Design a protein around this nucleic acid. Structure first.
Ligand SMILES: [Mg+2]
Ligand SMILES: [Mg+2]
Ligand SMILES: [Mg+2]
Ligand SMILES: [Mg+2]
Ligand SMILES: [Mg+2]
Ligand SMILES: [Mg+2]
Ligand SMILES: [Mg+2]
Ligand SMILES: [Mg+2]
Ligand SMILES: [Mg+2]
Ligand SMILES: [Mg+2]
Ligand SMILES: [Mg+2]
Ligand SMILES: [Mg+2]
Ligand SMILES: [Mg+2]
Ligand SMILES: [Mg+2]
Ligand SMILES: [Mg+2]
Ligand SMILES: [Mg+2]
Ligand SMILES: [Mg+2]
Ligand SMILES: [Mg+2]
Ligand SMILES: [Mg+2]
Ligand SMILES: [Mg+2]
Ligand SMILES: [Mg+2]
Ligand SMILES: [Mg+2]
Ligand SMILES: [Mg+2]
Ligand SMILES: [Mg+2]
Ligand SMILES: [Mg+2]
Ligand SMILES: [Mg+2]
Ligand SMILES: [Mg+2]
Ligand SMILES: [Mg+2]
Ligand SMILES: [Mg+2]
Ligand SMILES: [Mg+2]
Ligand SMILES: [Mg+2]
Ligand SMILES: [Mg+2]
Ligand SMILES: [Mg+2]
Lengths: 42, 54, 98, 116, 55
RNA sequence: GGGAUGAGCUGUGGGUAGGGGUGAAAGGCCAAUCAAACUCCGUGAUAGCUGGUUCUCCCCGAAAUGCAUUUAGGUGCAGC
RNA sequence: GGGUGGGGGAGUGAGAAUGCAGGCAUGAGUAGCGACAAGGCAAGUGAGAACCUUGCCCGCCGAAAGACCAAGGGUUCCUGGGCCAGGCCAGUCCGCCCAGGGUGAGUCGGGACCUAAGGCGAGGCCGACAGGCGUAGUCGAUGGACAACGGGUUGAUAUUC
């Protein structure tokens, strides 16, 4: 009866965080496009 | 089973009108000089002062 | 440019627990949230001209409150609980007699 | 007494035993109890039989009462006061009076008490 | 109101007209089996009474 | 009901990514989706197919056949 | 803010698309109100009590339904108020709403110490570009090394005072 989402803050950061997004040009474009859209969180 | 059709106004109202409260009958009581009315089944309690007339 | 010890200490803490510790001669201050224990101890000694036995600190997060539809947060604070050396002059807070 | 016809009080019958014993203890301790009408109607003969044992008042009767009741203070007061008080009455030691129902579930209420 | 504002006699008062109209309805959600969500209505009423004095 | 010192179970941390992975192999699993995930874009994809297409009156008023067709529930020309 | 007339222009007319949005019916005062541990009495409070408080009975768990952590949550903790939303009923109660308060470490759990799998990777090699891989190095506990016990106290902290 285990469900798909098992929260873990360290893993969430290491898999989706700012320093990971900025390590590749695809992630840099993702951050830039979220900035362009105007999101609060990148 | 699901309702095949919605009931007409007349048919809904015929069944809806039969849902009603029954009215209890009230008798007079004189307690502490004052007159009240209680259901007949509460006469003893009224005379012994166990009924709170608010 | 120049550093003043009075920029580290912001205000005293006025509460029932604080008043209970005044009887023990222990004082509670709100300090700037990036200072450390040694810095606070040096600043207190310089300002109030008193010997300091030890300084204890604790951070406290701000409370979330909702006003119209969305939450808002208060500021986080850092408190410093200062106990004086056994036989030093009391600190006059000038309005906190307890 | 005559067994309940239909579902017992408070769920099972092991619960009905305890309910009746507790109601009897409270009734003998205070002289007057307010509860739902079915509980009082079920309590009436149950309490009257204990009063009869107390009226007889021998050691065997006291043991037989202690079979059902567990409060020794109430057993003592029943064998010292309620028995001798009812020594001259042949049954009908309790009385049930109906009361206004209660909010929440509209349960009919009644009070049960000893005659004097 | 009849006795105070109108200066009428309380023993002569009879409930002439009375009715209950609908008020605004608040809407809630009850979760049901298998990801279903059903709606729950909280209804209110407006109750109007007209007493009148007559022999 | 089966295993329960083992080819065991489990926590924490890590790795393999879509014609790719992983698979004591069932086309199983890869975030409730898998004989090729998901999101955005090409993009208002295309559909000889199904459905829908909104006020009025006056005049006239059919066809469901022939030929051809990767054609036969489509279309072109003739007929009306 | 409109009428009439000569002209001009249309997002110009809906009953149907298992059309879209909103409001509202029918089913209907119907099903259901979430474990098979179980409640009761007396007194209190209060406008209002089956459910709140106190006391006493009764019953249930007890390799948990008790007591501590980690992860996760984020103020849900305490005090004083509140009672039209919420709580599958009511509620004077509340993990709900408002204000204020509350978390004290040389020794506990981490860093400032060490490294594993793995990651990044100065130069470098390779690759039309994009980039791939990797040396030195540097990160990375779930492991190694390293100093505190007993009692008391608050409404709320305690191997911390
Ligand atoms: Mg400056
Ligand atoms: Mg200390
Ligand atoms: Mg600390
Ligand atoms: Mg709040
Ligand atoms: Mg039978
Ligand atoms: Mg039942
Ligand atoms: Mg048994
Ligand atoms: Mg679910
Ligand atoms: Mg991983
Ligand atoms: Mg097959
Ligand atoms: Mg799946
Ligand atoms: Mg694919
Ligand atoms: Mg394909
Ligand atoms: Mg195109
Ligand atoms: Mg014609
Ligand atoms: Mg007009
Ligand atoms: Mg014009
Ligand atoms: Mg239109
Ligand atoms: Mg319409
Ligand atoms: Mg329609
Ligand atoms: Mg029916
Ligand atoms: Mg039912
Ligand atoms: Mg329940
Ligand atoms: Mg009471
Ligand atoms: Mg609380
Ligand atoms: Mg309420
Ligand atoms: Mg309610
Ligand atoms: Mg380089
Ligand atoms: Mg590399
Ligand atoms: Mg390395
Ligand atoms: Mg390290
Ligand atoms: Mg460790
Ligand atoms: Mg505690």
């Amino acid at each position: 009866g285990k469900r798909t989402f098992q929260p873990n803050n360290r893993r969430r950061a290491r898999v989706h965080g700012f320093r990971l997004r900025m390590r590749t040009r695809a992630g840099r474009s993702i951050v830039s496009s979220r900035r362009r859209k105007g999101r609060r969180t990148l | 089973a699901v309702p095949k059709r919605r009931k007409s106004r007349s048919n809904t109202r015929s069944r809806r009108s039969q849902w009603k409260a029954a009215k209890t009958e009230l008798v007079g009581v004189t307690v502490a000089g004052h007159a009240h009315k209680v259901p007949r089944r509460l006469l003893k309690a009224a005379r012994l002062g166990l009924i709170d007339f608010d | 440019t120049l550093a003043d010890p009075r920029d580290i200490i912001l205000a005293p803490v006025i509460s029932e627990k604080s008043y209970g510790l005044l009887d023990d001669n222990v004082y509670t201050f709100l300090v700037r949230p990036d200072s450390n224990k040694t810095q606070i101890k040096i600043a207190v000694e310089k300002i109030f001209a008193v010997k300091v036995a030890s300084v204890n600190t604790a951070n406290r997060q701000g409370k979330r409150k909702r006003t119209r539809t969305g939450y808002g947060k208060r500021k986080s604070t850092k408190r410093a609980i200062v106990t004086l050396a056994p036989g030093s002059r009391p600190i006059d807070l000038f309005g906190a007699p307890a | 007494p005559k067994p309940t016809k239909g579902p017992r009080l408070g769920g099972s019958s092991s619960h009905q035993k305890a309910i009746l014993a507790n109601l009897a203890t409270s009734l003998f301790e205070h002289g007057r109890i307010t509860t739902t009408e079915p509980k009082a109607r079920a309590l009436r003969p149950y309490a009257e039989k204990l009063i009869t044992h107390a009226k007889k008042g021998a050691l065997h009767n006291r043991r037989e009462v202690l079979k059902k009741l567990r409060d020794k203070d109430v057993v003592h007061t029943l064998f010292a006061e309620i028995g001798p008080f009812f020594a001259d009455r042949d049954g009908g030691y309790t009385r049930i009076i109906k009361i206004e129902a209660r909010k929440g579930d509209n349960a009919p209420m009644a009070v049960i008490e000893l005659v004097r | 109101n009849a006795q105070n504002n109108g200066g009428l006699d309380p023993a002569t008062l009879v409930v002439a007209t009375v009715y209950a109209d609908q008020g605004p309805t608040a809407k809630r959600i009850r979760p049901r089996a298998q990801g279903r969500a059903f709606r729950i209505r909280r209804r209110t009423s407006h109750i109007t009474v007209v007493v009148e004095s007559r022999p």
